[PDB]
């Protein structure tokens, strides 16, 4: 839940405004003075890609995912750039491929014979950990990811010969890929293609002729192996050599797109009719991810300069970039209507038709699986440890979380916001301010849970535009990437729902030469402007991508948004080096149920192992964190509390009779559905066991006091509906899905309505 | 190069501090590592925002507003200046053995706080029990008259 | 930590209070728990907004504006700062026995208010019945002339 | 409670009024129902915005800006403050007997206004028929030259 | 033409410097090449922003804020103004010979930074290994009591 | 009709010019062509922005700020007021014959500019060749160490 004023959008939400995107700290940005229309029809979006685990210790070389591990080691490791990383890798590969001594020494080691041939029967086995440990000494570097890529190259070319043990395995995690390409991401997608051309020549080395002469003769000298490896190393090194700067390719192909996008380019510096008729410029011209990447380029750099020969060189640098993009990459070209279909929109309407509140939300799918593992060391002062999954606990919690996913839809939250805003509406037009916008993105709070980050700093980043410098790099570098993604996704939604876009050029203060921005030409049939513009002429021209959402109709999401759980079950024998401790949580819990029976209070404690079917308190086990479930439940809670606070604010100043009865009936209907929801949770696996244990702890405490059994018609029903509400809160307390402060405030809201009394009043008969 | 938006308020405050005293000019010249002359250190301030921030750390009486303005404009000068500006504070000899005497007692505070709820719930429960009896009697009499 | 928009108003007020009197330095040193030196308590203020609010609750003449500005720009310090800043009022011995004699008055007032409407309608009705007769005559004559 | 935006402009105004004269202290203590101490009336102001509005009504020159700012930031206080802060206007002796002589006049005025148009149109028509004839001749001359 | 926002700050500062001393009027007339009269140099300043920047660089004690505001509002003029306002710095005789002695030192610094991480990480690690042992004992004791 | 934001700075400036001297009243009455009374010229200023700008061009010392503010806020009056305020500059008889002697110089400068790049590139190349040789040696030694 992020609340913004659509009128004071500068001081309200600067982190998503286009003035901030092209360098306006002030509010000064023009209406469409000088204009040039454009029609976007494609975009480079990433796929539906989430993070996963991949293992490197085997004899395979997968070039796309070694490229991906370079991405994560360069960016998410705090290193310089994947451009510099691929440059040092080319230097390393040149030094080991143009050196004949190395490919003799580490074949002498892994064959055992320096000068004399080996027979076909006296063939032993050396594990790849040993050849890695001596490759570290022979060919030194400072990056382990080069020694891995050399190790499994030589294990790939020796594995049919039978000189290596297939035993060991070893696994890293790969990270989260952004959807919308930055300038730097375009540079990196050009370098990653050249690295993939490097590695796919190493991946094709067969040693079929070496195996054939081994079988035919019975023996082979180590010099044939040392030649057959050092030939293939140089065949990849020959692919490595003779490349373009990715920076100077992308900066030159984005600058000429700027100069033929803008309406006010000088006649001097202006692309001629040859390069303008380059095969492919007509497709890169109507592309939107390139527009926002151009804005980010001229934002960061400030200006742009050409280096290449602008007549014949640049008319054959462009299809190299087209091939780098059109290759299998993270970023694929798609139509503009495809990439942003999980967004939905609704609004609260006046009698004239004007919006008062507008809600924009992401449509999610509740993930309902969960895993419990235990970490097992290998040796002391060595973080090589690996970790064992435990069925019979993860199965219990999965079977408990699977009914809770069938009651927490995301459409049924905005559908309750709208009923609130239609039930508390007066009869009077809205003129004093624009229609305030709430945007419900569970992904913000989900990354706040996933990185252990305060939500105040993300809300502050979206509000005042800037990020904080106090927090560390592994959270700031994800905050800035997330913030760029939200700006880009807003503009894809706005352009895909208002395809009438017209490019201007900002030159008011003009701290740059030319920095472009769209405007929209949405037709409205309204009279009073939301935001601040002029509504003249049957249509409005607005520069900002959020007001163009504030004039739409209700839109329905066609696709859910999906996050998948990480994979500990399949590879359970490998050792784990990725940080398992940030993505797992400690699981221990204590709760207690109290009830007064004729002026005497009875308390029943309960622990988590008694609920989980365990007898012994185990203390090593850790749950992999349910961030999607927790984020959906947090958005639901914050919306429930906000709706109740607005109805309590409007019931006091209603000053009417029928509208006052409507507000009161709305509150009662609201609280009884909340109570039935929690009580339906408290009949699941953990909840029913908590009931059957807390009842036993109560009953064996009434043992000394002889008391007469009660009516057993209503009294059983009342005590049943109270114990189930307690169990339903306790299970969401014990899984991380609810804090104790918010469970306590939710209990206060349910208690001050006499909601259990109004529910039991419909289990009587008069 | 320092941006003019910072420089407009940053330069005359440093110049007024130099006109107040020249004894800090030798201090900032030995601190940054430039020439002792005011024109040389002012050119270093104009050409490097890190040198400007180190001068606005050496003087902070009048240069606090200019320091905040350079802070709000450039973040990277702050990210480097927190590392370049670090004074290890003096520690007492009795500090860790003194802190060992409170282990028995912070545990007792937390074992109360887990039961009561929050820290604020503990403080408000402590105040409510330490409160006077006549407030309880006033509460009972307002409930007797029919108010809640 | 403390925001600079608040701190640029907080720091000169504390500086003026310390320059005005040194006894309040010892007062805030005993109240917060910092060292008695002005540099230490000023560092505690600049480090922690709760400590800044406790100092602005200690000094009250020139610190009210900075205190309210901190309460504006820090909404999350407010409940804990209220729980820490609590002085119980001194209740009189005669108050609840004095209140016990107004149950006769208040019940009659509430019955008449439930008859009329709201308390605002009761007050407006009482003022209209207490109002002068010439207003009734004026209302009758303005209705007689064709005005409503 | 009182908003800080109101409170920053409201509290030193009441403090300056008390520092101006102490004769208003007993006046506002009798008007609200507080004790005669300025700390008591200041606690009542900071607690209840209706009491804050009554104090900013009792002091009139120095607190009119804080009164209007309270009335801006609190629309809820306005009707109850108008109900409490009421004083009856003194009526003239021959007011209604003087007003009875204007039924001849205002009927004729409204009947003329119906035929003319608006009251603004009747005022402009009265000024046009009161206006000098040289303007009519100048209009006819500019139309004689073909200017319209 | 020159911007009005720039001219409102640039014209009275130059005219104040003219009324201060006319040797600077002769100096800027020789520097730009206009006629020596104040009206002629002011008509050049109001017409050409490059000439306005040259004059606001010729007077620098009192025209610094207007000069930097011109440099804010006109970023296009900055390249040509920097090119025309350029002087060669007097280089030192022992400088490059003293610099060639430091290839042994900078290579070791950069080799250490390649192992550690960034230069910020190297500075922080050098500070930590320069730090006293009592802080390590303090962190061990807080971990011993159960505090991460 | 003049804008109020313009008029609130224009009207007291004209009033200050009238309070300075009354000869300017007769001067602007002869210039604009209105009645010589100050009320008539002050009404003409508020009635017509063209007349307002012509008055602010007649009086020059204090009216330059309000004149630039009028030129900011009124774009439509700019071309018309530039036409109405035109005076021919005095031209010298030897100016064109003195200018004719310089084509030999300017043609060579334009050819060298076409070769090098812009005039900025020509200036930078002329400075780079005019520079000392020790800078070339310093560049060579920083490349010798391996720094680029």
Short mmCIF file of N, CA, C and O in Angstrom, two decimals, chain C residues 12 15 19 30 49 51 55 66 68 72 89 113 118 130 135 146:
data_model
loop_
_atom_site.label_atom_id
_atom_site.label_comp_id
_atom_site.label_asym_id
_atom_site.label_seq_id
_atom_site.Cartn_x
_atom_site.Cartn_y
_atom_site.Cartn_z
N UNK C 12 20.91 24.67 17.17
CA UNK C 12 21.09 26.01 17.75
C UNK C 12 20.24 26.28 18.98
O UNK C 12 20.65 27.09 19.81
N UNK C 15 22.23 24.73 21.70
CA UNK C 15 23.40 25.59 21.87
C UNK C 15 23.06 26.86 22.65
O UNK C 15 23.82 27.28 23.53
N UNK C 19 24.50 27.78 26.30
CA UNK C 19 25.17 29.07 26.47
C UNK C 19 24.43 29.97 27.45
O UNK C 19 25.05 30.83 28.08
N UNK C 30 21.88 13.97 33.65
CA UNK C 30 21.29 13.03 34.59
C UNK C 30 20.01 12.41 34.04
O UNK C 30 19.65 11.29 34.40
N UNK C 49 17.28 10.23 17.59
CA UNK C 49 16.14 11.14 17.70
C UNK C 49 15.32 10.96 18.96
O UNK C 49 14.66 11.92 19.38
N UNK C 51 16.73 10.46 21.90
CA UNK C 51 17.51 11.27 22.83
C UNK C 51 17.31 12.75 22.54
O UNK C 51 17.25 13.58 23.46
N UNK C 55 15.80 15.46 25.23
CA UNK C 55 16.39 16.76 25.53
C UNK C 55 15.40 17.90 25.29
O UNK C 55 15.31 18.83 26.11
N UNK C 66 11.28 23.22 18.04
CA UNK C 66 12.06 22.08 17.56
C UNK C 66 11.43 20.75 17.98
O UNK C 66 11.48 19.78 17.23
N UNK C 68 8.13 20.19 18.40
CA UNK C 68 6.98 19.96 17.54
C UNK C 68 7.41 19.65 16.11
O UNK C 68 6.74 18.89 15.41
N UNK C 72 6.55 16.35 14.05
CA UNK C 72 6.06 16.33 12.67
C UNK C 72 6.85 15.36 11.82
O UNK C 72 6.29 14.44 11.21
N UNK C 89 -0.45 13.33 37.23
CA UNK C 89 -1.02 14.54 37.81
C UNK C 89 -1.40 14.29 39.26
O UNK C 89 -1.64 13.14 39.66
N UNK C 113 -31.20 15.58 26.13
CA UNK C 113 -30.48 15.52 24.86
C UNK C 113 -30.99 14.39 23.99
O UNK C 113 -31.11 14.56 22.77
N UNK C 118 -29.05 15.98 19.22
CA UNK C 118 -27.73 15.97 19.79
C UNK C 118 -27.57 16.99 20.90
O UNK C 118 -28.49 17.76 21.22
N UNK C 130 -33.99 31.08 25.19
CA UNK C 130 -33.50 32.16 26.02
C UNK C 130 -33.44 33.49 25.26
O UNK C 130 -33.40 34.55 25.90
N UNK C 135 -36.59 39.15 18.32
CA UNK C 135 -36.17 38.29 17.23
C UNK C 135 -37.33 37.47 16.68
O UNK C 135 -37.42 37.25 15.47
N UNK C 146 -42.89 38.57 2.70
CA UNK C 146 -42.63 37.72 1.56
C UNK C 146 -41.22 37.20 1.47
O UNK C 146 -40.75 36.92 0.37
#
